[PDB]
């Protein structure tokens, strides 16, 4: 469509990586979609480690339209440490050029050893402002507030299949991409992209989770108890020590996610949940489960559930939009 759709690009079917440009010069830099991250992060020349000069790094001089703001701003997730300083330039997405607020990172040592392996130089932020740093409004939002595009929307085409090419289309949605129903949930708050449904694995029951969609997480969470109840006696190889699970590729024991709302219902089938690790094993696949447990009901729908389903998101419908996503071609 006249919209913007940005290419989303395949990599070992366990992410996609899309191409952006940053600064008048508009440098170009890899960055992977982020349904939580807010404030876009950008990879600084300023930046010493090593791991930043083996990928792109932006600089605050080649730009007439930059601004620093100067504010520091240091992010330390956990087992991690980075650093940056506020500063505002041109963000040229597709056809899109708008001045955003970006947080300049000049440290990256606790998640150096990984971005020195990954391709990407930074992230993508596509959140509410709730979870935007120095209050900064989401990108969507501003080219919406501007004559850019007509709708604060943004939808998801992830590049599962080899073939595949993966695609953002912002501004509008395209019937192409998904093939038959087009379902919307609302949202259980406003904050980031999240939604209540009622989660049924056969047998086992969990109604009012809050699953939530992240592009970012390439595989889909679950409290720990559900993930255990429901793997009994499945022929599921656990890896001790290791947060990874291996399984028989042909195996009839292994179940179908499903999660039932009002408004419809979703079902992630086996040849999603499932890895081809047959590299080191042949006929061994691996669960993409991660469980984990928070302080309210909740659920991952990441990469597996996206790869599947067409997703959609509109701050103004305040909801998230689901349909198949239509076949590779
Ligand atoms: N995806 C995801 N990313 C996260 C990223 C961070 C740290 C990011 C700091 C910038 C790192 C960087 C950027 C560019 C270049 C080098 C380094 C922390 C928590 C989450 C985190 O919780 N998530 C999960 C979901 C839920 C809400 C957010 O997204």
């Not at 007439?64 to 703001?69: A, N, Q």
């Not at 709302?261 to 089938?269: H, M």
């Amino acid at each position: 469509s006249s919209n913007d759709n940005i290419e989303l690009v395949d990599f070992q079917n366990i992410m996609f990586y899309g191409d952006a440009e940053v600064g008048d010069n508009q440098q170009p830099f890899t960055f992977i979609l982020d349904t939580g991250s807010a404030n876009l992060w950008v990879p600084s020349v300023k930046c010493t480690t090593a791991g930043c000069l083996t990928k792109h790094l932006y600089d605050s001089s080649k730009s007439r339209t930059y601004e620093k703001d100067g504010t520091k701003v240091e992010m330390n997730y956990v087992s991690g440490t980075v650093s940056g300083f506020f500063s505002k330039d041109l963000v040229t997405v597709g056809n899109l050029s708008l001045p955003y607020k970006f947080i300049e990172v000049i440290d990256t040592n606790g998640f150096e050893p990984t971005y020195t392996a990954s391709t990407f130089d930074g992230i993508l932020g596509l959140g509410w402002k709730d979870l935007s740093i120095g209050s900064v409004d989401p990108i969507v939002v501003e080219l919406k507030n501007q004559n850019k595009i007509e709708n604060a929307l943004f939808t998801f085409y992830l590049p599962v299949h080899d073939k595949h090419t993966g695609f953002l289309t912002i501004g509008g949605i395209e019937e192409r991409f998904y093939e038959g129903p087009l379902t919307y949930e609302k949202l259980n708050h406003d904050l980031y992209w999240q939604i209540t449904l009622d989660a049924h694995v056969g047998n086992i029951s969990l109604e009012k989770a809050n699953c939530i969609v992240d592009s970012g997480t390439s595989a889909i969470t679950v409290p720990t108890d559900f993930l255990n109840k429901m793997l009994q006696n499945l022929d599921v190889i656990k890896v001790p020590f290791l947060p990874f699970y291996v399984t028989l590729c042909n195996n009839s024991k292994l179940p179908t996610f499903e999660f039932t709302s009002e408004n419809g219902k979703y079902t992630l089938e086996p040849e999603y949940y499932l890895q081809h690790i047959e590299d080191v094993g042949p006929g061994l696949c691996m669960l993409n489960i991660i469980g984990l447990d928070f302080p309210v009901p909740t659920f991952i729908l990441g990469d597996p559930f996206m790869r599947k389903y067409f997703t959609v998101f509109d701050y103004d419908n305040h909801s998230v939009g689901i349909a198949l996503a239509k076949k590779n071609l």
